[PDB]
Amino acid sequence: KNKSRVARGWGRKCPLFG
Numbered sequence: 001k002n003k004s005r006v007a008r009g010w011g012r013k014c015p016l017f018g
Contacts, residue, residue: 007017 004017010016012018
């Protein structure tokens with residue numbers, strides 16, 4: 001599974017995945 005790899009959804013400015 002993707003714990004942080006899913007961050008691709010947005011960028012970094014978002015806290016969700018930093």
